[PDB]
Amino acid sequence: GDVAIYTTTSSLTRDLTRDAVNFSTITLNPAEQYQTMDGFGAAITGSTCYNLLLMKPADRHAFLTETFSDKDGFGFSYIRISIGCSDFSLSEYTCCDTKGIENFALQSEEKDYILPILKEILAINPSIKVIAAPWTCPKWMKVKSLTDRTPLDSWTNGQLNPDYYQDYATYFVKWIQAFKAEGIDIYAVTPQNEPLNRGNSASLYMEWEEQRDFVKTALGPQMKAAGLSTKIYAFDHNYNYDNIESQKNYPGKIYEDAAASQYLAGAAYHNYGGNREELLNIHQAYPEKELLFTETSIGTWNSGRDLSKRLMEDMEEVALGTINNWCKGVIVWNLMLDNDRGPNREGGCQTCYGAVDINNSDYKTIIRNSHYYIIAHLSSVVKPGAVRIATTGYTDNGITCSAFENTDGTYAFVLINNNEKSKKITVSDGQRHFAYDVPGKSVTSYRWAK
Ligand SMILES: OC[C@H]1O[C@@H](OC[C@H]2NC[C@H](O)[C@@H](O)[C@@H]2O)[C@H](O)[C@@H](O)[C@@H]1O
C-alpha cells in the first residue's frame, strides 16, 4: 500500500510484523523542524563479534543483512565500538600496552574480530556511522590521582597523567588512521567511556576539567592537524552525573571554555542513572550543541528478556524519550550475547543480555530482546538526514509519538500505545490521510511518500 507499517506487541502477537494501508488525530507539521537524525543502532563488541563468527557464515550474513540492510532489513545505521578493550572484549588490552606511543598497533582483537565483522557490516551498509570510545588508556599513561602522581598499573581506576595528554591524543589519531587504512571511517569519538566510573573491568576517571584540558590542548588540535573530520562528543556517562556535585552539568562546564568548545559537536549520554529530563536542560542551555544517546543495557537487574516488562518502557525512555529530548541518535550496548550473557569479563558486566541473544549450543537460534525492537522501529523508517518535525492533534493517555521527514521526501512516524486496548488513530501530512487500529501494548512505525 501507500503506507508501510512495522508492528511489535509486548505479547509477541506481532514481531516487527509488516502491514500496509492506503490513503483514504495526529497531524504532522513539516514546517516546524527540530534536530536532524544521524542514526540508530547497537555496539559491535568483541563478544558480539565472537558470537557472530561462531555462526554458520550464511546465518551470520542473514542476521547482519536483516539488521543492517536498508533495502533488505531494518537499516540499523549507527554502531559503537571500543578503542582498545571494553568489558565485552576477549581480554584486557589497549592498542599500546608497551610503554612509548611509538609502539602503537591494532591488536589481535581488532584484526581477528572487530575488523572482519565491521567489514561485513559495511558491505551490507556502506554509509553506517561508527562512534568509538576507550574504556581505559594504556596503563602507563595513568597516575593514581592528580594529587598523587605516581604510576598505577591498573586496567581500572586512575586518572590520565597530564604529561601524557599529547601522546594520548596521538593514540586517538593513530587508531582513527589505522581504521581508515582498513576502510572504516570513524564518524565520532568520545574521550573516555563513562569518565565518572572507577569500576568495571576497564576504566579511567576523568573529570570535566581534565576532559576540557585534554580536548582543547591535545585531542582537538591533533585530530584537526591530521585532517580528520571525526566529531568529538563530551561526557559519555549518566544523566545524574553520578551524584557528584563538582561534576554536575559536566559538558556545560566544558562548553563554557571557548578553547575546548570549538572542538566539541556536543555531548553523549547513557541512562544508567538519573532522568532523561536532563537532556532538555542541556539543550535549552546550549542549543548550538548536539546531543547523542550512546549506551543503555538490559540484564538480570531489569528483567531484560521479558518483553512484556521491557518493550513499552524501553521505547518510551530509551527511544522516543531521548529523540523527543533533542538526541540525534540512539545506540544500545552489545548487539549479540550468548544465553550465558557472554563472553564476559571478571569485574565487568556479567548480568547483561544482548539486543538479541544467541544459543551457544547451535549458534543459530536467536531471540530478539527489547533493544533490537526499539532500534529497528526507529531505523526501519527514520533514515540518516531525517529531520524531526512537530505533531499537533490530541494528547492521549498512554500514547507517545515522534514524526520526521526523510531527505527522500518520505514522512516517517513512530508510535507507542502503552494501553491494553487498541486505539484507532488517524494520521495527516496535510495533503494525505490514513487510519489504522493500533494494537494494545504496541510500537508501530510508519513510512509513506509526500
Ligand atoms: O547499571 C546497570 C548494570 O550495568 C552493568 O553495566 C553494563 C554496562 N554499563 C556501562 C559500561 O559503559 C559498560 O561497559 C557496561 O557493560 C553493570 O556491570 C552492573 O553492575 C549494573 O547493575
Side-chain angles (χ1 to χ4, degrees), residues 87-88 135 193-194 200 272 295 297 301 333 349 352:
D87 60 332
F88 289 90
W135 266 240
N193 180 66
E194 298 213 321
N200 210 338
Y272 297 101
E295 207 197 292
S297 285
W301 70 90
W333 194 211
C349 185
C352 287

Side-chain angles (χ1 to χ4, degrees), residues 160 165-166 169 189-192 206 208-223 232-235 254 257 259-265:
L160 183 60
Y165 280 18
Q166 290 308 326
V189 296
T190 65
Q192 175 52 42
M206 187 188 294
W208 71 262
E209 304 93 332
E210 296 176 84
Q211 187 160 113
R212 178 196 63 198
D213 291 352
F214 182 51
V215 168
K216 74 182 177 168
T217 72
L219 182 62
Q222 285 202 33
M223 291 177 56
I232 306 168
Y233 287 90
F235 186 48
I254 302 165
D257 180 328
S261 171
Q262 66 181 324
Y263 296 116
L264 296 173

